[PDB]
Amino acid sequence: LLFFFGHIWHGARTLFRDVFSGIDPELSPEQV
Amino acid sequence: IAQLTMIAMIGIAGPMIIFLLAVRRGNL
Amino acid sequence: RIPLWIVATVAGMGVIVIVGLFFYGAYAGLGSSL
Amino acid sequence: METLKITVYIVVTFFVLLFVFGFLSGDPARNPKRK
Amino acid sequence: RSWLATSHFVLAFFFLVGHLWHAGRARAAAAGFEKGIDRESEPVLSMPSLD
Amino acid sequence: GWFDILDDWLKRDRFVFVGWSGILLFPCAYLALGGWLTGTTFVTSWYTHGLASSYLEGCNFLTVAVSTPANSMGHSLLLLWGPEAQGDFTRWCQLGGLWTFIALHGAFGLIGFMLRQFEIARLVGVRPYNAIAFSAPIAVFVSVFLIYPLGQSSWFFAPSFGVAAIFRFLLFFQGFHNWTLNPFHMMGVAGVLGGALLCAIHGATVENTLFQDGEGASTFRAFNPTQAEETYSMVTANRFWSQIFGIAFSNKRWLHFFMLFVPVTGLWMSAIGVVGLALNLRSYDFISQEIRAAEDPEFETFYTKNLLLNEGIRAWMAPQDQPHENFVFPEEVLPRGNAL
Amino acid sequence: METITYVFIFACIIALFFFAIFFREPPRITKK
Amino acid sequence: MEPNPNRQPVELNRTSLYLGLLLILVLALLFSSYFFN
Amino acid sequence: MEPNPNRQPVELNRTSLYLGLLLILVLALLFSSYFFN
Amino acid sequence: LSGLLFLAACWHWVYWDLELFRDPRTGEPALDLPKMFGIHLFLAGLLCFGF
Amino acid sequence: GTTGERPFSDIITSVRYWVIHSITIPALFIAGWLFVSTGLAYDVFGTPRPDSYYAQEQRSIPLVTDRFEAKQQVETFLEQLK
Amino acid sequence: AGIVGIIAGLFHILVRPPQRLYKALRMGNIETVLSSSIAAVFFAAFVVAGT
Amino acid sequence: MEVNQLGLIATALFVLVPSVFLIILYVQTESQQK
Amino acid sequence: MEVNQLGLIATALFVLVPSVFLIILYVQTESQQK
Amino acid sequence: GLPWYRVHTVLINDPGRLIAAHLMHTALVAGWAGSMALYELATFDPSDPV
Amino acid sequence: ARRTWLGDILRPLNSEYGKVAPGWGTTPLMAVFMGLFLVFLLIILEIYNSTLILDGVNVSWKALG
Amino acid sequence: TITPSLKGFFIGLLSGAVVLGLTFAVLIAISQIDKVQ
Amino acid sequence: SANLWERFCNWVTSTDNRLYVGWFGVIMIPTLLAATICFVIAFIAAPPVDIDGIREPVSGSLLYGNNIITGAVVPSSNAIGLHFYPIWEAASLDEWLYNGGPYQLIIFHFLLGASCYMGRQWELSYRLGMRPWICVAYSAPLASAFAVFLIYPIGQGSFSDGMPLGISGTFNFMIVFQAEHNILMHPFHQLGVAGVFGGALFCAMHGSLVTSSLIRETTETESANYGYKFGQEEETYNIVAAHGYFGRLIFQYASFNNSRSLHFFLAAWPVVGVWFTALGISTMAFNLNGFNFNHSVIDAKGNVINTWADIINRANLGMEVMHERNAHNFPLDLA
Amino acid sequence: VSYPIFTVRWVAVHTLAVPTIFFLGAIAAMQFIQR
Ligand code: CLA
Ligand code: CLA
Ligand code: CLA
Ligand SMILES: CC1=C(/C=C/C(C)=C/C=C/C(C)=C/C=C/C=C(C)/C=C/C=C(C)/C=C/C2=C(C)CCCC2(C)C)C(C)(C)CCC1
Ligand SMILES: CC1=C(/C=C/C(C)=C/C=C/C(C)=C/C=C/C=C(C)/C=C/C=C(C)/C=C/C2=C(C)CCCC2(C)C)C(C)(C)CCC1
Ligand SMILES: CC1=C(/C=C/C(C)=C/C=C/C(C)=C/C=C/C=C(C)/C=C/C=C(C)/C=C/C2=C(C)CCCC2(C)C)C(C)(C)CCC1
Ligand SMILES: [Cl-]
Numbered sequence A: 001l002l003f004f005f006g007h008i009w010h011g012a013r014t015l016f017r018d019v020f021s022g023i024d025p026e027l028s029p030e031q032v
Numbered sequence B: 001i002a003q004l005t006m007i008a009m010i011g012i013a014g015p016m017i018i019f020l021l022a023v024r025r026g027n028l
Numbered sequence C: 001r002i003p004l005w006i007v008a009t010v011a012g013m014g015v016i017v018i019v020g021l022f023f024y025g026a027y028a029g030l031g032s033s034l
Numbered sequence D: 001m002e003t004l005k006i007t008v009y010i011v012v013t014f015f016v017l018l019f020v021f022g023f024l025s026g027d028p029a030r031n032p033k034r035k
Numbered sequence E: 001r002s003w004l005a006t007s008h009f010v011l012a013f014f015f016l017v018g019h020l021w022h023a024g025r026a027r028a029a030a031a032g033f034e035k036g037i038d039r040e041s042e043p044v045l046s047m048p049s050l051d
Numbered sequence F: 001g002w003f004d005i006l007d008d009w010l011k012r013d014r015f016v017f018v019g020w021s022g023i024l025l026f027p028c029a030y031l032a033l034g035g036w037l038t039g040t041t042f043v044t045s046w047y048t049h050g051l052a053s054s055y056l057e058g059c060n061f062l063t064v065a066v067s068t069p070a071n072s073m074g075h076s077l078l079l080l081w082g083p084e085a086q087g088d089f090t091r092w093c094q095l096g097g098l099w100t101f102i103a104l105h106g107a108f109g110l111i112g113f114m115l116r117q118f119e120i121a122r123l124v125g126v127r128p129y130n131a132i133a134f135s136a137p138i139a140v141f142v143s144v145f146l147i148y149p150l151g152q153s154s155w156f157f158a159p160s161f162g163v164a165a166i167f168r169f170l171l172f173f174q175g176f177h178n179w180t181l182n183p184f185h186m187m188g189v190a191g192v193l194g195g196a197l198l199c200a201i202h203g204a205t206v207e208n209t210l211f212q213d214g215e216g217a218s219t220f221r222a223f224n225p226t227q228a229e230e231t232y233s234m235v236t237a238n239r240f241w242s243q244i245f246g247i248a249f250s251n252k253r254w255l256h257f258f259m260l261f262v263p264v265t266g267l268w269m270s271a272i273g274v275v276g277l278a279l280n281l282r283s284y285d286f287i288s289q290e291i292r293a294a295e296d297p298e299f300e301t302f303y304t305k306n307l308l309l310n311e312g313i314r315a316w317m318a319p320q321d322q323p324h325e326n327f328v329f330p331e332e333v334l335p336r337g338n339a340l
Numbered sequence G: 001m002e003t004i005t006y007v008f009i010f011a012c013i014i015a016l017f018f019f020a021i022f023f024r025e026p027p028r029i030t031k032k
Numbered sequence H, I: 001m002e003p004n005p006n007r008q009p010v011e012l013n014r015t016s017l018y019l020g021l022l023l024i025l026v027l028a029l030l031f032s033s034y035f036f037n
Numbered sequence J: 001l002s003g004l005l006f007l008a009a010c011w012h013w014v015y016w017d018l019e020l021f022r023d024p025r026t027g028e029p030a031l032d033l034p035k036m037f038g039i040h041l042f043l044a045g046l047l048c049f050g051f
Numbered sequence K: 001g002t003t004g005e006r007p008f009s010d011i012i013t014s015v016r017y018w019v020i021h022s023i024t025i026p027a028l029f030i031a032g033w034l035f036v037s038t039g040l041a042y043d044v045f046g047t048p049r050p051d052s053y054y055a056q057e058q059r060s061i062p063l064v065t066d067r068f069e070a071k072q073q074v075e076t077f078l079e080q081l082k
Numbered sequence L: 001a002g003i004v005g006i007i008a009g010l011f012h013i014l015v016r017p018p019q020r021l022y023k024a025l026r027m028g029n030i031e032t033v034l035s036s037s038i039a040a041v042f043f044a045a046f047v048v049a050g051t
Numbered sequence M, N: 001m002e003v004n005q006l007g008l009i010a011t012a013l014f015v016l017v018p019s020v021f022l023i024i025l026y027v028q029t030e031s032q033q034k
Numbered sequence O: 001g002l003p004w005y006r007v008h009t010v011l012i013n014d015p016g017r018l019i020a021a022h023l024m025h026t027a028l029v030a031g032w033a034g035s036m037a038l039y040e041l042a043t044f045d046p047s048d049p050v
Numbered sequence P: 001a002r003r004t005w006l007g008d009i010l011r012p013l014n015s016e017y018g019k020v021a022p023g024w025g026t027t028p029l030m031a032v033f034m035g036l037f038l039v040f041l042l043i044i045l046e047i048y049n050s051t052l053i054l055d056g057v058n059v060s061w062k063a064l065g
Numbered sequence Q: 001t002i003t004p005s006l007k008g009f010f011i012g013l014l015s016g017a018v019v020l021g022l023t024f025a026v027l028i029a030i031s032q033i034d035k036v037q
Numbered sequence R: 001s002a003n004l005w006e007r008f009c010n011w012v013t014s015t016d017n018r019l020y021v022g023w024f025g026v027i028m029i030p031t032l033l034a035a036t037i038c039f040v041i042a043f044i045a046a047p048p049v050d051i052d053g054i055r056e057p058v059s060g061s062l063l064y065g066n067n068i069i070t071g072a073v074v075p076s077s078n079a080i081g082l083h084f085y086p087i088w089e090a091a092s093l094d095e096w097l098y099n100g101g102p103y104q105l106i107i108f109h110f111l112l113g114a115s116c117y118m119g120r121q122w123e124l125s126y127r128l129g130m131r132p133w134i135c136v137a138y139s140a141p142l143a144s145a146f147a148v149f150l151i152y153p154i155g156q157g158s159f160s161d162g163m164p165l166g167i168s169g170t171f172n173f174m175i176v177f178q179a180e181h182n183i184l185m186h187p188f189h190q191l192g193v194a195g196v197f198g199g200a201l202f203c204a205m206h207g208s209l210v211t212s213s214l215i216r217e218t219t220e221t222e223s224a225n226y227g228y229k230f231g232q233e234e235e236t237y238n239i240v241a242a243h244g245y246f247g248r249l250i251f252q253y254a255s256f257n258n259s260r261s262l263h264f265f266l267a268a269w270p271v272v273g274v275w276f277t278a279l280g281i282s283t284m285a286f287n288l289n290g291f292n293f294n295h296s297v298i299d300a301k302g303n304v305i306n307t308w309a310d311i312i313n314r315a316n317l318g319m320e321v322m323h324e325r326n327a328h329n330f331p332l333d334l335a
Numbered sequence S: 001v002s003y004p005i006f007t008v009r010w011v012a013v014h015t016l017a018v019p020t021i022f023f024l025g026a027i028a029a030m031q032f033i034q035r
């Protein structure tokens, strides 16, 4: 049950390596 | 037996005294 | 066009009625004690 | 034991007096601006 | 005795809150910052650092 | 390629975002909520617990529930088309098939939902710290509604979906597991209670350290939706708590991570404790205490007092709480104090 | 022995409290 | 040998020490009772 | 406050660590028997 | 076996900059994960079978 | 701040909506009502009627005691006029 | 499973990962091997705890 | 009383070792020039 | 056997505490720039 | 520099020192197994398997 | 860098770094074994849970000796 | 061979595939109706 | 000297003190110091206390066989009830410690100081020119201490029924409470956990959302916290990117975009919820208990068809029947 | 604008709205059952 978190954590840190350390400008949201 | 007749009138009375004012348009 | 404030106040009372019916059923239906 | 009662009573009176005479001493004044 | 006691305690309590609330605003209203800290003249920034 | 066209459609910015996750989320989530609302009003718990559990029988919002299956079922998945129900729907209902329905479905619904968090975050290009946080509620549901009964005799001893049906789950764990005396549980409430403090104290701190950005008293309008300057004086807040409490934040980035850590860590600790309760590896007693209590009839602590409460809970509840055991406790064997 | 251990840890936490409050890192503004 | 260019320095601020020590101590104050049992 | 100008840095080289640890360990290996008695 | 793995760990620590870990193309450290997995998986199944 | 969907405000206000829903909404209500009042709900979910919890004399509970022959055992419980 | 493991092994030694996948599962990034391994590890763990 | 013998050292090591770890880091951090 | 109960923790603290002291110093020395 | 919970990120792209690390771990786990057995053999009583 | 006897022999095995297959490569074929694996697990699960009974398999301490 | 519970398994394995089918069927269809860029 | 007293008032009110000893502080600091010192000494070395007034001393101190988890400061005797029992009301300290003397000295000093602590949370805010109402948020946890230490004893007619000062002693207070009041089936308590669960929920909500939407200013191998400096002008996180995400998690209009409307909700929810849970204990202090659905649903013949509410009642009976063994002589527990 | 009628939102809304009232009607009828 503890290792589940490790999976979720490292999984996230892999697919979100770019946005790690923070994000950056632009202002798009509610318009495709 | 069924005094729900009372409530009904006194209940719709509230919104009425301001609905009539939405008709005569003034002082809301 | 039906004024919003009328839609709410009507649907409002409509909720108080059905919910109030439930509270009545607590003293009459199977959920009673008599 | 009857002494302790006196002592405590005196002590409590002290701080309570400090409290009342405190806010009395123009407390609303004590603030950044309007006073 | 149960109905009255409980009812009037809830009211009494909330009124003590009502007190704190309205007394706290009145002190801030009078001195004049009940609407936010002055961006320019920020009082804290004029006090020596305790650190 | 049809895939990228399928993708295109799913990831379209609608009112209610679907996404790939939605293919798993919405079906389960709807059936879970639906299954509950169904059983809550119609399905009974007579043949499984000897209990009325629906509005149709006379139960109210508090006393209604979707009760667990019988102890006879074991850890059976209780499929509608399984050996038990045998395709029959009515039988399926009467055997508490709706419980495993809600449980398993809702379980996948929680998987899909976190996936949604992951998927949406990626698209918007934000960090997935919302998904990390949501792991704590998962662990709880998994440990309590799945792992725990999997360690017991059957699904019967899992928490039944219902208001009152959860209250007995609390009292049970007290009486049988002495759950309050468990260190993992203590950390649990410490996180939740402490988390409900951070929530309160931070909100109040901000609202009462705000800058004046308007001429009205209702300062809500006076907020700039487009970032720029800080809406509240972080510097004033620091000096405040530094003088009333002695300690104070001074780094919004840490302050907010702390608001993530505390409640998520707490729920995780409470999960581990429950995982141990599955094997009944509880924190029931203190051996040093019992040994003195045996030899010395005058030694009494608030700990000994509580255990006596537990014995009462077990003895008076077990008969109607565990029907499958056919318990029969004579009046003379029932542990009782004086007069009462 | 047990009592000693309990009071010791407690005394250590109170000691920490002191240093945490009066021997913290001075919170410096802007130029940090 | 060549100085390994993959290493960075390690850091632990004063608060982190305090926050750390607070965690360790209170955990010990929580589990000591069960350790003595 | 004024930064106290009486302070110097403290130093302990790698050997001193080794020589130290060697002293502590062998002392423990010597006195442990008498500690258990 | 623990003692041997210990000594080996030391060797692999001091002699970290083996060419085997450097990619011929980019000249920088790189590991071809997909092929590695295949190798290991082959060894695993081979050892699994024998067992 | 907007998407394709027609703003709820407009729809809940449109006369056409109510012309539709003054029919649809009560229809479902009366339907749900009939579902209970006709006793159909009792059979769809095997929920016992007020006079179907016990037998006249019997005071025991129809507890299912085995998983595989449960369905058969349940039917046997309905047999004793329960 | 051993034989299947031997076969599967040979496959991953020869056939290369599809561009779509290599991009998706961020291959050539060892911190994704961990995410998957851990996932398999706790999966196996939940099983042995049950058996 | 009738407590656990290992309770003492279990509590002692539970405090020191991780606290020691921290202090080692803090002091080595503190002593970094500039 | 019939040894001293405090013998274990006495030996444990006799090792850790002074060794810990050294390590704290070495690591804080090691981490000094230039 | 690096936070305490990040000290091992020093290996993310250093195959040599990463193998050295995994080697040390494996050594500890193998070390435990052997020595944990000795502990059991020093305390286990075979006098009665019943 | 540092070449070694063993290192050179293992050089080929580690060189095809960024090498990927084009397009959706073997993905559809993989998705079939995946679907087969999912059903495979579901079978041995429902067998263990006695949801899937088979005359010949007795999921108890019996059927042993 | 082919026991009642095994027959039920196929029924659940088949009725499940259907749900997956019809779901993806509708999806692939509607998806390829509007997505202009 | 401009004037001793004038200077004194200036030192007290001074905002240049490391700890703001206010006018409320003049009462707070002494009372809190008396409470804590007496507590610490009691918790460690106090002798057994005859809480139920039935000459059956309950030891709750470390030196007397307790540990942190079991140890507690035992409430005053039931023979004292609501009578005021200061040290100078006892023939000796031995008697004072036997009748649960310390308990009153602590709770009275604490509640007094803890009230002044709230008063001070206004004062400093006033001296610093910031808005008040922070103390209003602290009124909720305070009102709970009041309810648990003062209101419930007043209602029940004795301080012996106030919550003990200890871990296990607190558990006893709950279990017994549940038996006699059925607190789980009371709206105010339910609202309490709603605020508390919601609190922890929202605390994690806000916490995560904000920290996940931080503007990048840090290295890949550098703490993301350093990307903020104490005393910034602009914000350290993209609240517009935060709203964009959470707005898509559920649906736009069910998401906050106003930081001020956010933090108000963040503060309002738990405080209001705990306010009710505090009013719950204060209401059930006059025996206005939770819902009693015992033997509600019955069949056509009259047989009692049990619900989960009945299963709860059985557990409650066990607690009732077993609590305070030798304290009862009569059938009904009306005290 | 020329808004559509049947949308994904419409579907979702109805999956909850339609059963709800059907249940609200059912429950409302239960209030008259007796013995
Ligand atoms: C994608 C959404 C989704 C998911 C994941 C689930 C998941 C589940 N549902 Mg479910 N359900 C859904 C949508 C979903 N549902 C919808 C929309 C409805 C409304 C119609 C239902 C109605 C429903 C009911 C009424 C019941 C379930 C049940 C279940 C559970 C057991 C079902 C089972 O055995 O799976 C079987 C898994 C499969 C069939 C997947 C197979 C996929 C492969 C790739 C296809 C291969 C087919 C091929 C012929 C195989 C050839 C092999 C050869 C050897 C023959 C499971 C948790 C049961 C339950 O909760 O029991 C307590 C139950 O009784 N569902
Ligand atoms: C499968 C094994 C495995 C491996 C190889 C890693 C590897 C890594 N993790 Mg990790 N992790 C794992 C499992 C694993 N994790 C699990 C199961 C969890 C869930 C609890 C986590 C949660 C986690 C978090 C939350 C973080 C990492 C981070 C990291 C990276 C830096 C590690 C570091 O410097 O920490 C050094 C850690 C310490 C110096 C303190 C450790 C003290 C521990 C808690 C006390 C107990 C020690 C004891 C001997 C452990 C017994 C082992 C047990 C399994 C038998 C590194 C790549 C970090 C990262 O990505 O950096 C950005 C990070 O923030 N991990
Ligand atoms: C020469 C190699 C070797 C051999 C023969 C043994 C032999 C043994 N070890 Mg051992 N060990 C070794 C190396 C070895 N060890 C090393 C290097 C380590 C350090 C990591 C250990 C650490 C270790 C521990 C900690 C323990 C043992 C134990 C044991 C004993 C019981 C083994 C057992 O139950 O298996 C256990 C079987 C498994 C764990 C199965 C693992 C299979 C996994 C789950 C599959 C992995 C996924 C796979 C890649 C999927 C693809 C496969 C494909 C076919 C589909 C046995 C005497 C135990 C004992 O009694 O102590 C003496 C024990 O507790 N070992
Ligand atoms: C009759 C009579 C009488 C009386 C009179 C009076 C005094 C009356 C009053 C009346 C009134 C005074 C009424 C009122 C009413 C009200 C109401 C009925 C309301 C309702 C509300 C609602 C429904 C709301 C809604 C909403 C919502 C829900 C949400 C938000 C929005 C809104 C707000 C819209 C007398 C004595 C002479 C006797 C004789 C007869
Ligand atoms: C189980 C099952 C299923 C499912 C089903 C479904 C899905 C259903 C749904 C259902 C639903 C979906 C229902 C609903 C219901 C609802 C309701 C019944 C509600 C109510 C409400 C109310 C009552 C409200 C109240 C309130 C509140 C809450 C707040 C405040 C105010 C008021 C008072 C208003 C299927 C077939 C698939 C399969 C088989 C089995
Ligand atoms: C070098 C060498 C050698 C030697 C070797 C040796 C001597 C080894 C040893 C090794 C060892 C002897 C190892 C051991 C290890 C151990 C370990 C690694 C352990 C660990 C443990 C743990 C980690 C635990 C934890 C815990 C606790 C504490 C409590 C709570 C629970 C738990 C379980 C978590 C020889 C001569 C042969 C040869 C060649 C060279
Ligand atoms: Cl008691």
Ligand SMILES: [Fe+2]
Pocket: F202, F206, R206, R210, R263
């Ligand atoms: Fe905030």
